């Protein structure tokens, strides 16, 4: 073979140039990232038991859900936490290379199997199965340089005009608002209610 | 029907909030969740239902 | 890509901001990614230059030394084509592989 | 010597980088209010913007929100540094910046404040270091588990040379206010239990009644008591509920109150109650040493208390466990390829006898530079295997040809091969050495990874050149004489 | 080389052009394969000497 | 029986405020008319698996459902991964003309 | 239009904006590659032009 | 049909033919959403449309 | 709502199949604004009030 | 505490009527018994992903 290209240099040049051209064209389209997909996929199950202490949450929802979740394919490890607010978060980490979509489907199937055993209160709230992350990619803060709007106004503007379009942007897994949307707060006064013989 | 009504009313969950919850008064220093769980566990508590 | 999409979306939102509102970026890991890629590419070109000098030291002839240097772009661009074919991306790990 | 160096080389997963940002947190004691947390966060922000004004660009403190556990007694701050260009020197890097911060943050006396660098795999965990999971495997109970954790911290504090910044990743037990609703007294007073529950919940925790339209957007409607009636245990008596007779009756009539202590956030790992511990290795120590010490310390805990690694530590342990297999399989594959190509078993053995020459150089390079046995080093070790085998090929293959085609003697052919193939060997070796030289001497944004990738394989090349250029003739001659 | 690049059209129409590209490229490959091995065998046998 | 305004402010806004986190979502449009029907359409990028997209949309809708009025739930919310144009129409005719 | 009134393109309009017309670049690449193949075939840099 | 319908019918009648690709509408057509960003209201949005 | 918009109360079985049950005002009583006054609601005292 | 007729007419028929839009469905069968259990079985094609 080497003799064939020794006698035919232009053939070798053409081969090299074609390879280089393909390489440049590929470079144009190739995505750029710091690392490839390295972290194992994670699936989060969030359920709320309104007005339940941490001990009640672990016994009533988390234990029931975890018991069924065992046996899913390519499950690496699980973790859970029950807050005093009643929220229960079951995080399932799967082996690297697992297709996260199929993992979510299987987790939903197991959660459907385990749901009737849960308290009716947490069934009403609705349990969430979502692909989960651990660290914020980016934090975008909003300030008012005029010093006219407090945190409530800025937060409401963000929740009403910026959170949703970003939440639906491609590749945005989750958006947490470091504030609170406006709400019609009614601040009751027990003295006045008792004076008028009313109750909440 | 009366037995059903009493049984439904007896057991429930109360979202009793917290002491010193947000928004707090200026100067507050203690924040504790309030737990009011009037739940019935054994048989005798059910039997004792009015 | 998501960072750029987010920035484009914020750019679209900005005109409708009330007076005095300002968007700040108190935390972002994308600049590190960009600077790290720039650094690894700088390392790559420095490596190419250093390799050229080493061969020229032994070959002591520009035309003679040019022949192996021609083998660098062809192989590297072929590698990029292969990465594109199998769905791999241009990351710091592939860049380290090319530097090696 | 190669074995001795490999045994003594500390291990780690991935080097930390200076990504221009780092995190901070504050964990005030249980029962702390929002205002006390805000004061601590203001102190942290003031420190960042005055003592580190040249390095810190901006601080974004978030009260009431934590990476693990959300409460009024927690808070975090995202700190963004200046551009890398504006921060020269090692003193102006995340390692040194957070080291200086922790020196100030360890004297707060009001909270547990930590500043930590981001992990390499940001998706895997929230902070650099390790993720210890103390597990209650014997069903001892929550109280024993926290007692086990407290003892573990007592042991850890005795080794500040290895472990540093070791903190729980949860919330300590908090005082809880219990209200005992004596239902029979309520029935006697003629007050429905539903009214009691609704009144208490709406008064002290708010109630999402329904929605309303605010400038065309659906927003919630909440009712909650005013703040000043929602602060003290005395304020329970201020709330009245209407009885069936129509007479308002205070909460004090039919209820009592008592204080308890319960955990606000309970955790489970793989179906067993567990406490998560986060920490870092002391400067001058690798993550592997810290993990080994943590396992040793967890060994001395009372029976029924297990442990496990998760996240970054899980991946690091997996890498450490799978490495030897990888090395063995790679060596076997290389041996088989050499046997197939050269149609011999003698030639591959003589070539493979060269791999230690490159490996010892790779280990010496890491030992001198104080690097560790990272995944990058593992990749380098494989590259050095390849390079040493390449030099052995460049000598042996030419030596083998003369013995067959020209029918020369064993010693004569080896001498001729060593004489003729010296220059190509040096050319390729120096080409590789200067190729990875920019990685080794790099000092910039990604210098942590670049040094790890380059340093290990560079020294491997210099020894696979210097040693092999002399030892490969010995291996070839000795093997051929025995025809083994 | 004439028909391959139209396979890599971007956008929504990219598949539309990719269909033609793949079809014609495969047809040409099969055609030259047939002309290389199939047809010469037929020419030797079928063609009566002229 | 709900008019357009009621349909929007009680169903469409409630549902669409929870339609976030879905992958490969090009754009979302929704409309509610006087007949009382709300129609939220979510278009995805080409090549998106329709089954997985439907699963994710259904998950978000399951989160948002309990906030909806009871009548809406009883009528039955439907999620369909169908096209826009009719593939075919199968008309039925009574030749006798007796039926209506 | 007055303040607060944005706009956007949907459907086909949306699909056209994202799609870029790469046809001239693709055809240029095709011409270059065909020339290279011809140069390889004839072992000449000039003959391909014919 | 359009000539007959539009001339006579009091209502807007549109006889039309579905395109080759149903999603890609008229080659000259476009869809233009006019979004009320500032929460002005339906009345102001309609005025802006006018 | 039940008079002017129809209400779906529950189901019934028709020839073996489950079908809905609706209540609505007869057409002639929900056609004009004046038809509002025809509808009465019963008070607590038991009196029909328009 | 429901009979077969009750179980059918109140559960099975409703579920069957609302089982539309599933893919690769070969046949479905269901039953209701005196115990009160409705069992609906859907059988899919061989290659279907469970």
Numbering used by the authors:
A (entry chain B): 1 to 200
B (entry chain A): 201 to 250
C (entry chain B): 301 to 400
D (entry chain B): 550 to 1033
E (entry chain C): 451 to 500
F (entry chain C): 51 to 150
G (entry chain C): 850 to 899
H (entry chain C): 650 to 699
Original paper wording:
The K. pneumoniae AcrB (KpAcrB) multidrug efflux pump belongs to the resistance-nodulation-cell division (RND) superfamily of efflux transporters. This inner membrane efflux pump assembles with the KpAcrA periplasmic adaptor protein and the KpTolC outer membrane channel to form a tripartite efflux complex that spans the entire cell envelope to directly extrude drugs out of K. pneumoniae cells. KpAcrB adopts the overall fold of hydrophobe-amphiphile efflux (HAE)-RND-type proteins and forms a homotrimer.
The MST analysis indicates that the equilibrium dissociation constant (KD) for KpAcrB and Ery interaction is 14.4 ± 2.6 μM. After confirming that KpAcrB specifically interacts with Ery, we incubated 10 μM KpAcrB-nanodisc sample with 500 μM Ery for 2 h to form the KpAcrB-Ery complex. We then solved the cryo-EM structure of this complex to a resolution of 2.96 Å. Superimposition of the apo-KpAcrB and KpAcrB-Ery trimers gives rise to an overall root-mean-square deviation (r.m.s.d.) of 0.36 Å. In comparison with the structure of apo-KpAcrB, the conformation of KpAcrB-Ery is distinct in that the three protomers are in the forms of “extrusion,” “binding,” and “access,” respectively (in a clockwise direction as shown Fig. 2D) instead of “extrusion,” “access,” and “binding” conformations (in a clockwise direction) as shown in the apo-KpAcrB trimer structure. This Ery molecule is located deep inside the distal drug-binding site of the KpAcrB pump. No extra densities were seen in the periplasmic clefts of the “access” and “extrusion” protomers, suggesting that only the “binding” protomer is occupied by Ery. How Ery binds in KpAcrB is very distinct from the interactions observed in EcAcrB but quite similar to the mode of Ery binding in the N. gonorrhoeae MtrD pump, where MtrD was found to house Ery in the distal drug-binding site with aromatic residues F136, F176, Y325, F568, F610, F612, and F625 responsible for binding.
